[PDB]
Design a binder for this molecule. Structure first.
Ligand SMILES: Nc1nc2c(ncn2[C@@H]2O[C@H](COP(=O)(O)OP(=O)(O)NP(=O)(O)O)[C@@H](O)[C@H]2O)c(=O)[nH]1
Ligand SMILES: Nc1nc2c(ncn2[C@@H]2O[C@H](COP(=O)(O)OP(=O)(O)NP(=O)(O)O)[C@@H](O)[C@H]2O)c(=O)[nH]1
Ligand SMILES: [Mg+2]
Length: 414
């Protein structure tokens, strides 16, 4: 048998709208990540999607067919059990141009990524460029490029695009990243992709001794109709642990917390609770480490967690000292081009009184620029952000022609 363990790595799936990200995750894991009404009606990803799979290898078989996602080798001609390698998970991002901030929130959780490029569309499309640049900014450098939809183009066309893609990465951080052609729809060459994931997206080193921090991307009420009272539960909070670890029965807090009034002023009150349960996918555990999207059960009123109410928060231990800042100072750099627009315009300098969008961890917040210098801006936010370390990366967006566009990045200085 294979062990039941949490996923140990998060692989982002990014790329232009409809290039096949979600179909690819389904080809690997058997799971369709889209769970929301609007996603199903529109045929698009809106919220971050998630799926897990075990990975193993049939030692008696040849590669790539030796790589499997279930404990059997019958497909490659062996009655032996495959050797378990690890459990992996996917963070499935939206490709739509208006959902770039959601891709950025997911990118904060990624240990590596697959950039999906459709073989039957001109290259490079706007969000092919924009997601690529975002991965570079955030430092997600363990990248595989997947050339999808090869089932609907000729060999010649696929080869032409392949050369295009290699030339695009030439002279960039991604110069040596592999390109793997697949059909996600017809599940062609998925075994080569799993081999690629093992070779190029290794599980990173973790630091389990640092103060535990989880970035929150989901929160829910898990109580369903027709359930007996003794099976009812408190609110659940979902996210990825970026350092340290968490255990059942630990006292924790959610930051910045709840928006309340305190002395005629808006304030955020930290939400204190205790971990009642820990789950990854359909499995319960007593502790949770980095890797995977964990569901942290709490004793909170489910009205507090319902419908992603806490998206963008962080969870720490109750006694941790974490800055929660309404005003932030950013050591910044600007991109030269608005890469995500259909026509790449030049980026204008930041000016005082501009409203900008700041991506910090899993959070997205608007703020007004109160001060500009050569390498520093100060921003007054509409909601405070939890800043759990010094030199946390932020991505900066500006509204241009009715869309939020990534224009720069920086370090939050505390
Ligand atoms: N011919 C072909 N169609 C494919 C392939 N992969 C996906 N598609 C089709 O492309 C469309 C979009 O697929 P989807 O997986 O939703 O793409 P996405 O990149 O996740 N979209 P979004 O950016 O909105 O999340 C669907 O009609 C799907 O069936 C493929 O390998 N071949
Ligand atoms: N820690 C914890 N997580 C739970 C519990 N029940 C459900 N979850 C998690 O909360 C999330 C929401 O689950 P749910 O609202 O039941 O819908 P769901 O995700 O469709 N359920 P399922 O995936 O099993 O069909 C999932 O990640 C699930 O694993 C619980 O008792 N404790
Ligand atoms: Mg999708």
């Amino acid at each position: 048998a294979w062990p039941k363990v949490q996923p140990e790595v998060n692989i982002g799936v990014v790329g232009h709208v409809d290039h096949g990200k979600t179909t690819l995750v389904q080809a690997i894991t058997g799971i369709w990540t889209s769970k929301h009404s609007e996603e199903l009606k529109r045929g698009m990803t809106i919220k971050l999607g998630y799926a897990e799979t075990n990975i193993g290898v049939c030692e008696s078989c040849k590669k790539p067919e030796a790589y499997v996602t279930e404990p059997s080798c019958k497909s490659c001609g062996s009655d032996d059990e495959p050797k378990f390698l690890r459990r992996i998970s996917f963070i499935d991002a939206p490709g739509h141009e208006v959902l770039m901030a959601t891709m950025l929130s997911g990118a904060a959780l990624m240990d590596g990524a697959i950039l999906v490029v459709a073989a039957n569309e001109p290259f490079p499309q706007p969000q092919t460029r924009e997601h690529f640049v975002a991965l570079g900014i955030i430092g997600v450098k363990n990248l595989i490029i997947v050339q999808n939809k090869v089932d609907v183009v000729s060999k010649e066309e696929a080869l032409s695009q392949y050369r295009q893609i290699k030339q695009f990465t030439k002279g960039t951080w991604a110069e040596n990243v592999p390109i793997i052609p697949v059909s996600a729809l017809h599940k062609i060459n998925i075994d080569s992709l799993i081999e690629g994931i093992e070779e190029y997206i290794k599980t990173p080193y973790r630091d389990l001794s640092q103060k535990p921090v989880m970035l929150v991307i989901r929160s829910f009420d898990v109580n369903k109709p027709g359930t007996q009272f003794n099976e009812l539960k408190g609110g659940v909070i979902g996210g990825s642990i970026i350092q340290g670890l968490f255990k059942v029965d630990q006292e924790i807090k959610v930051l910045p917390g709840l928006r309340v009034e305190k002395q005629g002023k808006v304030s955020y009150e930290p939400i204190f609770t205790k971990i009642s349960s820990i789950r990854f996918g359909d499995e319960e555990f007593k502790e949770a480490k980095p890797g995977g999207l964990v569901a942290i059960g709490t004793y909170l009123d489910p009205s507090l967690t319902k419908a992603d109410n806490l998206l963008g928060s962080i969870i720490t231990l109750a006694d941790a000292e974490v800055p929660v800042l309404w005003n932030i100072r950013i050591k910044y750099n600007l991109l030269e081009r608005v890469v995500g627009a259909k026509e790449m315009l030049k980026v204008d300098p930041i000016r005082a009184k501009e409203t900008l969008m700041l991506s910090v961890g899993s959070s997205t917040t608007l703020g007004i620029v109160t001060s500009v210098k050569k390498d520093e801006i100060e921003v007054e936010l509409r909601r405070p952000v939890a800043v759990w370390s010094n030199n946390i990366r932020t991505v900066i967006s500006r509204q241009i022609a009715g869309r939020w566009r990534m224009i720069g990045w920086g370090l939050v200085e505390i």
